[PDB]
Amino acid sequence: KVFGRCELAAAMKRHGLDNYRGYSLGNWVCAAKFESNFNTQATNRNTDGSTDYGILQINSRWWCNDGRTPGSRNLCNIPCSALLSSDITASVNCAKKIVSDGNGMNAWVAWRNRCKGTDVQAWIRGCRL
Ligand SMILES: [Cl-]
Ligand SMILES: [Cl-]
Ligand SMILES: [Cl-]
Ligand SMILES: [Cl-]
Ligand SMILES: [Cl-]
Ligand SMILES: [Cl-]
Ligand SMILES: [Cl-]
Ligand SMILES: [Cl-]
Ligand code: NA
Ligand code: NA
Ligand code: NA
Ligand SMILES: [Ru+3]
Ligand SMILES: [Ru+3]
């Protein structure tokens, strides 16, 4: 599913991501924009052989099981395919664990490079929330 901008903001808020660990909703929408262009089915292979899955491009090295990432963990206790669903619950619940791991949203390199320090509220501007 390809979410609209405000549609995704609303879904993220319903699932408790707004201000989670102090990160306002626009941070999460901005991250999803640059990770996946709001497409739940996005996948991308990393040089190390791991793969990133879903709207927030969550990586099989640590967070989900795909059966094809040697030596990896599955800290969210989910198949990576669950991160591709039109229902964002699994992605949100796993993102909550990731953002709590110590480095906040810097875990998403694209958030650090493209969202951090910017006017992230623009990503939710105009949305009925
Ligand atoms: Cl957009
Ligand atoms: Cl915001
Ligand atoms: Cl596993
Ligand atoms: Cl594996
Ligand atoms: Cl594990
Ligand atoms: Cl599994
Ligand atoms: Cl949803
Ligand atoms: Cl933080
Ligand atoms: Na939804
Ligand atoms: Na894994
Ligand atoms: Na749901
Ligand atoms: Ru930890
Ligand atoms: Ru860690």
Side-chain angles (χ1 to χ4, degrees), residues 84-109:
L84 306 184
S85 175
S86 55
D87 179 330
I88 69 168
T89 299
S91 281
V92 169
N93 284 353
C94 188
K96 287 174 178 181
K97 298 179 186 311
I98 297 168
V99 77
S100 302
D101 196 67
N103 288 337
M105 269 201 89
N106 298 288
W108 289 273
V109 170

Short mmCIF file of all heavy atoms in Angstrom, two decimals, residues 84-109:
data_model
loop_
_atom_site.label_atom_id
_atom_site.label_comp_id
_atom_site.label_asym_id
_atom_site.label_seq_id
_atom_site.Cartn_x
_atom_site.Cartn_y
_atom_site.Cartn_z
N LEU A 84 5.70 -5.55 5.53
CA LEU A 84 5.25 -5.12 4.21
C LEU A 84 3.74 -4.98 4.12
O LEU A 84 3.22 -4.56 3.08
CB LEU A 84 5.74 -6.09 3.13
CG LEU A 84 7.25 -6.35 3.11
CD1 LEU A 84 7.59 -7.22 1.93
CD2 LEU A 84 8.02 -5.05 3.03
N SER A 85 3.03 -5.31 5.19
CA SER A 85 1.57 -5.32 5.20
C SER A 85 1.00 -3.93 4.99
O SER A 85 1.61 -2.91 5.33
CB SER A 85 1.11 -5.83 6.57
OG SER A 85 -0.29 -5.77 6.69
N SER A 86 -0.22 -3.87 4.45
CA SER A 86 -0.94 -2.60 4.40
C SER A 86 -1.26 -2.08 5.80
O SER A 86 -1.46 -0.87 5.97
CB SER A 86 -2.23 -2.75 3.59
OG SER A 86 -3.02 -3.79 4.11
N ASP A 87 -1.31 -2.96 6.80
CA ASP A 87 -1.54 -2.59 8.19
C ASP A 87 -0.17 -2.31 8.81
O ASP A 87 0.69 -3.20 8.84
CB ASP A 87 -2.22 -3.78 8.87
CG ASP A 87 -2.51 -3.56 10.35
OD1 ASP A 87 -1.78 -2.83 11.04
OD2 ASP A 87 -3.48 -4.16 10.85
N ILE A 88 0.05 -1.08 9.29
CA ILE A 88 1.37 -0.66 9.75
C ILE A 88 1.69 -1.09 11.17
O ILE A 88 2.77 -0.74 11.67
CB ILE A 88 1.63 0.85 9.57
CG1 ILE A 88 0.77 1.70 10.52
CG2 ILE A 88 1.44 1.25 8.12
CD1 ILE A 88 1.21 3.16 10.58
N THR A 89 0.81 -1.84 11.83
CA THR A 89 1.01 -2.20 13.23
C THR A 89 2.40 -2.79 13.49
O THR A 89 3.11 -2.36 14.40
CB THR A 89 -0.07 -3.17 13.70
OG1 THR A 89 -1.36 -2.55 13.59
CG2 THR A 89 0.17 -3.57 15.15
N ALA A 90 2.80 -3.80 12.70
CA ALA A 90 4.08 -4.45 12.97
C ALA A 90 5.24 -3.49 12.79
O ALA A 90 6.18 -3.48 13.59
CB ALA A 90 4.24 -5.70 12.11
N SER A 91 5.21 -2.68 11.73
CA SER A 91 6.26 -1.68 11.53
C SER A 91 6.34 -0.70 12.69
O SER A 91 7.43 -0.35 13.14
CB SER A 91 6.09 -0.94 10.20
OG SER A 91 6.55 -1.72 9.12
N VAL A 92 5.19 -0.21 13.16
CA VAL A 92 5.18 0.76 14.25
C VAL A 92 5.71 0.12 15.53
O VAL A 92 6.54 0.71 16.23
CB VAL A 92 3.78 1.34 14.47
CG1 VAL A 92 3.74 2.12 15.78
CG2 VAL A 92 3.37 2.19 13.30
N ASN A 93 5.24 -1.08 15.86
CA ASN A 93 5.66 -1.70 17.11
C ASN A 93 7.16 -1.97 17.08
O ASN A 93 7.84 -1.82 18.10
CB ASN A 93 4.88 -2.98 17.35
CG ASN A 93 3.47 -2.70 17.82
OD1 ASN A 93 3.12 -1.56 18.10
ND2 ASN A 93 2.66 -3.75 17.92
N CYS A 94 7.68 -2.37 15.93
CA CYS A 94 9.11 -2.62 15.83
C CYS A 94 9.90 -1.32 15.87
O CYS A 94 10.95 -1.24 16.53
CB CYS A 94 9.41 -3.44 14.58
SG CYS A 94 11.11 -4.03 14.42
N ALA A 95 9.41 -0.28 15.19
CA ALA A 95 10.07 1.03 15.24
C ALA A 95 10.17 1.55 16.68
O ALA A 95 11.16 2.20 17.03
CB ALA A 95 9.33 2.03 14.37
N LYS A 96 9.15 1.29 17.50
CA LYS A 96 9.23 1.71 18.90
C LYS A 96 10.41 1.07 19.61
O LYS A 96 11.08 1.71 20.43
CB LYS A 96 7.91 1.39 19.61
CG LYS A 96 6.75 2.30 19.24
CD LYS A 96 5.45 1.84 19.88
CE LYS A 96 4.31 2.79 19.54
NZ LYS A 96 3.04 2.38 20.18
N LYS A 97 10.68 -0.21 19.33
CA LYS A 97 11.84 -0.87 19.92
C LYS A 97 13.14 -0.27 19.38
O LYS A 97 14.07 -0.01 20.15
CB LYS A 97 11.79 -2.37 19.65
CG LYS A 97 10.59 -3.06 20.26
CD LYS A 97 10.58 -4.55 19.94
CE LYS A 97 9.29 -5.21 20.42
NZ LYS A 97 8.97 -4.87 21.83
N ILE A 98 13.20 -0.04 18.07
CA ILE A 98 14.42 0.49 17.45
C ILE A 98 14.77 1.85 18.04
O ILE A 98 15.92 2.10 18.42
CB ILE A 98 14.25 0.57 15.93
CG1 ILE A 98 14.05 -0.83 15.34
CG2 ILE A 98 15.45 1.26 15.29
CD1 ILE A 98 13.58 -0.82 13.91
N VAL A 99 13.79 2.75 18.11
CA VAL A 99 14.05 4.11 18.58
C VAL A 99 14.38 4.17 20.06
O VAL A 99 14.89 5.19 20.53
CB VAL A 99 12.87 5.04 18.22
CG1 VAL A 99 11.70 4.82 19.16
CG2 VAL A 99 13.30 6.50 18.19
N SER A 100 14.11 3.09 20.79
CA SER A 100 14.44 2.98 22.21
C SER A 100 15.80 2.35 22.45
O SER A 100 16.19 2.20 23.61
CB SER A 100 13.36 2.16 22.93
OG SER A 100 12.08 2.76 22.78
N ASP A 101 16.53 1.97 21.40
CA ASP A 101 17.76 1.18 21.54
C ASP A 101 18.96 2.00 22.00
O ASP A 101 19.99 1.40 22.35
CB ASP A 101 18.09 0.48 20.21
CG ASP A 101 19.11 -0.63 20.37
OD1 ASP A 101 18.80 -1.66 21.02
OD2 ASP A 101 20.23 -0.48 19.84
N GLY A 102 18.86 3.32 22.03
CA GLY A 102 19.94 4.13 22.56
C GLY A 102 20.28 5.34 21.71
O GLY A 102 20.66 6.38 22.24
N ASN A 103 20.14 5.23 20.39
CA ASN A 103 20.52 6.31 19.49
C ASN A 103 19.32 7.06 18.93
O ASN A 103 19.47 7.87 18.01
CB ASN A 103 21.42 5.77 18.37
CG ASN A 103 22.81 5.42 18.87
OD1 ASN A 103 23.27 5.94 19.89
ND2 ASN A 103 23.46 4.50 18.18
N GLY A 104 18.13 6.83 19.49
CA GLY A 104 16.97 7.53 19.01
C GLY A 104 16.76 7.29 17.53
O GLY A 104 17.02 6.20 17.01
N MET A 105 16.34 8.34 16.82
CA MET A 105 15.97 8.15 15.43
C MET A 105 17.23 8.16 14.54
O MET A 105 17.12 7.92 13.34
CB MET A 105 15.00 9.28 15.09
CG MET A 105 13.55 8.87 15.34
SD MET A 105 12.26 9.77 14.50
CE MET A 105 12.14 8.82 12.97
N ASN A 106 18.42 8.40 15.12
CA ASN A 106 19.64 8.26 14.34
C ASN A 106 19.83 6.84 13.83
O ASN A 106 20.63 6.62 12.91
CB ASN A 106 20.87 8.70 15.14
CG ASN A 106 20.82 10.15 15.53
OD1 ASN A 106 20.97 11.05 14.69
ND2 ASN A 106 20.57 10.40 16.81
N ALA A 107 19.11 5.86 14.40
CA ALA A 107 19.13 4.51 13.85
C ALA A 107 18.77 4.51 12.37
O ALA A 107 19.26 3.67 11.61
CB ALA A 107 18.15 3.63 14.62
N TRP A 108 17.91 5.44 11.94
CA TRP A 108 17.56 5.61 10.54
C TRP A 108 18.52 6.65 9.97
O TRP A 108 18.36 7.85 10.19
CB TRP A 108 16.11 6.06 10.39
CG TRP A 108 15.11 4.98 10.72
CD1 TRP A 108 14.61 4.05 9.86
CD2 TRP A 108 14.49 4.72 12.00
NE1 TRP A 108 13.73 3.21 10.51
CE2 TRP A 108 13.64 3.60 11.82
CE3 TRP A 108 14.58 5.31 13.26
CZ2 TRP A 108 12.87 3.09 12.86
CZ3 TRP A 108 13.82 4.78 14.29
CH2 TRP A 108 12.98 3.68 14.09
N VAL A 109 19.53 6.18 9.23
CA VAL A 109 20.53 7.09 8.66
C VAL A 109 19.86 8.17 7.82
O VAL A 109 20.25 9.34 7.86
CB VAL A 109 21.57 6.28 7.87
CG1 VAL A 109 22.48 7.20 7.07
CG2 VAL A 109 22.39 5.40 8.81
#
